[PDB]
Design a protein around this ligand. Structure first.
Ligand SMILES: Cc1cc2nc3c(=O)[nH]c(=O)nc-3n(C[C@H](O)[C@H](O)[C@H](O)COP(=O)(O)O)c2cc1C
Ligand SMILES: Cc1cc2nc3c(=O)[nH]c(=O)nc-3n(C[C@H](O)[C@H](O)[C@H](O)COP(=O)(O)O)c2cc1C
Ligand SMILES: C=C(CO)C(=O)OC
Ligand SMILES: C=C(CO)C(=O)OC
Ligand code: NA
Ligand code: NA
Ligand code: NA
Ligand code: NA
Ligand code: NA
Ligand code: NA
Lengths: 404, 404
């Protein structure tokens, strides 16, 4: 059903805030949202250009791109997700960042790497193995699937982990700058590669990158440090999901509790800020949501208050913020400290003008989960059109094409 | 009476436009509007800080400051107008431009110089004479007033005209950059100094700065050229009022018609643009208004179509644009070419949120001419408050004070 909402115009959500070297004019953010409308070779498409453009119209909005692969080894979905490792990728993304910028808005790219959850058949076509901190699978079914095609998950060697820092993420960061991105965001959430390194259920390494809380965090902090020297700390973000059990992360049932793991990481980030190397923002997923799934109040085992107590800079929070609509009591509490951004993913899919709707209390159009991950324009850019002009069958047939 | 208006949200008025090196998100502009709420020594005041801040809230709005004196010799009003010639002036203005910038908006400073209309008693206190291109007065009364205090208008010498370029306007431009202004605008309108040079009723010089159309334009083009080498052409604007008879400019009754004078100037500006030295914008006053006065359709002797035909860059037009409210037929025609900005001065005085009102068709609050030029906060920042919280007598007593 459509969601009745009270206007946020006079709230902290429309007070300006400096994030790194840019100033946002709204604290409402579009978080990274995988949609699979990139081209087959992972170049961003004509559909994506319009999609991000349509969401940039409140001047001074921050948009964060869907998970974007840092390298071929970083990939592994059957759906067509974008990349940022070739000149072709960067040039196409630049058309998109140009369009967002022309509206006075800003864009961060979420750099991802799937790791142990990469599809083994897909990776086999690249002549690649699924890789991770350790040789583990999210399920027995995944293990059987990988071994059945003779392409098991394997642990990255120490040198390969160094390669992530000095090659894969370095090149991705360089391409991201070529592409005109205002920030790069390390995806360290939701059980993908960086989360696999951070937490013990996924990392049993015996080199410098595992075997202790500090060792497990080492790769992530090494990426933060190295990339800061390339692009500047003011252009860096990171996303974490301490409480999530998406893709079989054990979370509060792990041998090290998320409060320990993630407080360690956040405090190390704050110590860098104290030394003049403060990253632009930390993005955190609220315990109401785990990956792309809502979590019952019953199953919630912690909260993200620790991030606020430990980190002094900008925080982006997201996860079912309309649960207490129309009055948005929780959203208002969460932004009261004046350094907190609030993200809406699912409602931004069906409301390209979401910032405007939230500003003036306009009923939210319900989203369509059925078309979250499909391969064509129906349920993608169609939310920007009047229905009477949406030819559904034509749009279902409209697959992504090259920009211009 | 309050003005009913139709929403401009879906019009060209909310399409982005690059002006010099900045992109505006609305084409609605606040034009230079003298209000006399600066400090006695011409430093910008606490009241001005709030006043410009209040008008910057639609992100990506261009605000142009009230006439701002380039030097002591440039002054001459009894009211307290601001200046931009000392470090103190620049530092105070920087607080204001900082505030506008934090809202994602931009600010141009209108550089002025009164010339022959400077009050002779005021100038006598500075040990200065009123000066001009030639020794003329706007009226016999002005002549009698100046001679009665033994302080006649006098013609600037050739060297003094050079001093305007290399000293007065050079320093003002430098201070404007220190103050964080995005543009500097030469006031060549309304019968002030630069207009006095351009037109023959006010300029009978026999040196290189008078005696022909080209010679009369020489100072203005010399300022454009010299200041372009200092701040860049992308940071320069100019205002002209071809049809105005404000302060006794003869206009269409002069010995050279405004179409001749101003087409010459605009074409010279376009030739500079063809060579890569295109200034950011030309601001023109529509024939509906002369200075601060409306002009009857009967008395209108020309239009500004020539500027559009000759100049290929950004044009700002202003002058009673709400005359055909609610539908704004003329405004819409004028912005249809996609390179034209539209200014509202008088309605911006009583509607600090004017861009927002025009966007969504909110009734315009009528302005109060009685408080256009008074010395205190009543009728100045009071338009941003709810009435029930406006203590009128306290506000009348609130004169400008130092920022912070
Ligand atoms: C279809 C879909 C795709 C998503 N893709 C990503 C992603 O690529 N990276 C990421 O960090 N989170 C991703 N998420 C999680 C969202 O960014 C967000 O945290 C979550 O949906 C909760 O916010 P919401 O309640 O406003 O939707 C995705 C969520 C959905 C529903
Ligand atoms: C009180 C007042 C002060 C003004 N001050 C200036 C000024 O300093 N410089 C200038 O170029 N025009 C000045 N103008 C002219 C305006 O910028 C504008 O061109 C004129 O008012 C017509 O626009 P409007 O009908 O929207 O008010 C002033 C006008 C008024 C009414
Ligand atoms: C599609 C999801 C859902 O959380 C994801 O995080 O992709 C990186
Ligand atoms: C106050 C006016 C009215 O046009 C003026 O132009 O000041 C520079
Ligand atoms: Na737009
Ligand atoms: Na825009
Ligand atoms: Na908070
Ligand atoms: Na503001
Ligand atoms: Na703002
Ligand atoms: Na036009």
């Amino acid at each position: 059903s459509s969601v009745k909402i009270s206007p946020l115009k006079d709230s902290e959500a429309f007070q300006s805030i400096k994030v790194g070297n840019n100033t946002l004019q709204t604290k409402i953010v579009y978080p990274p949202t995988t949609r699979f409308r990139a081209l087959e070779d992972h170049t961003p498409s004509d559909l994506q250009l319009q999609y991000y453009g349509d969401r940039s119209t409140f001047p001074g909005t921050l948009l964060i791109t869907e998970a974007t692969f840092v390298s071929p080894q970083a990939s592994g979905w059957e759906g067509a997700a974008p990349g940022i490792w070739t000149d072709k990728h960067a040039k196409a993304w630049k058309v998109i960042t140009d369009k967002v910028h022309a509206n006075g808005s800003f864009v961060s790219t979420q750099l991802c790497f799937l790791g142990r959850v990469a599809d083994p058949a897909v990776m086999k076509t690249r002549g690649l193995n699924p890789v991770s901190a350790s040789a583990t699978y999210e399920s027995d079914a995944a293990k059987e699937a990988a071994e059945a095609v003779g392409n098991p998950v394997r642990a990255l060697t120490t040198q390969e982990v160094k390669d992530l820092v000095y090659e894969a993420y370095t090149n991705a960061a360089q391409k991201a700058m070529d592409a005109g991105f205002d920030y790069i965001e390390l995806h360290a959430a939701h059980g993908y590669l960086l989360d696999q390194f951070l937490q013990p259920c996924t990392n049993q390494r015996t080199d410098e990158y595992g075997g202790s809380i500090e060792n497990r965090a080492r790769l992530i902090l090494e990426l933060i440090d190295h990339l800061s020297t390339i692009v500047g700390a003011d252009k860096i973000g990171i996303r974490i999901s301490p409480w999530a059990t998406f893709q079989n992360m054990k979370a509060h049932k792990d041998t090290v509790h998320p409060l320990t793991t993630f407080s360690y990481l956040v405090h190390e980030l704050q110590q860098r800020a104290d030394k003049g190397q403060g990253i632009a923002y930390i993005s955190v997923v609220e315990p109401r949501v785990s990956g792309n799934v809502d979590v019952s109040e019953e199953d919630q085992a912690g909260d993200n208050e620790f991030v606020s107590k430990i980190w002094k800079g900008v925080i982006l929070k997201a996860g079912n913020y309309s649960y207490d609509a129309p009055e948005f009591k929780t959203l208002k509490e969460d932004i009261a400290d004046k350094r907190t951004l609030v993200g809406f993913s699912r409602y931004f899919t069906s409301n390209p003008n979401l910032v405007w709707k939230l500003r003036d209390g306009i009923d939210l159009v319900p989203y369509d989960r059925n078309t979250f991950y499909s391969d064509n324009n129906y349920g993608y850019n169609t939310f920007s059109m009047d229905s009477e002009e949406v030819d559904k069958e034509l749009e279902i047939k409209r697959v992504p094409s090259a920009i211009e």
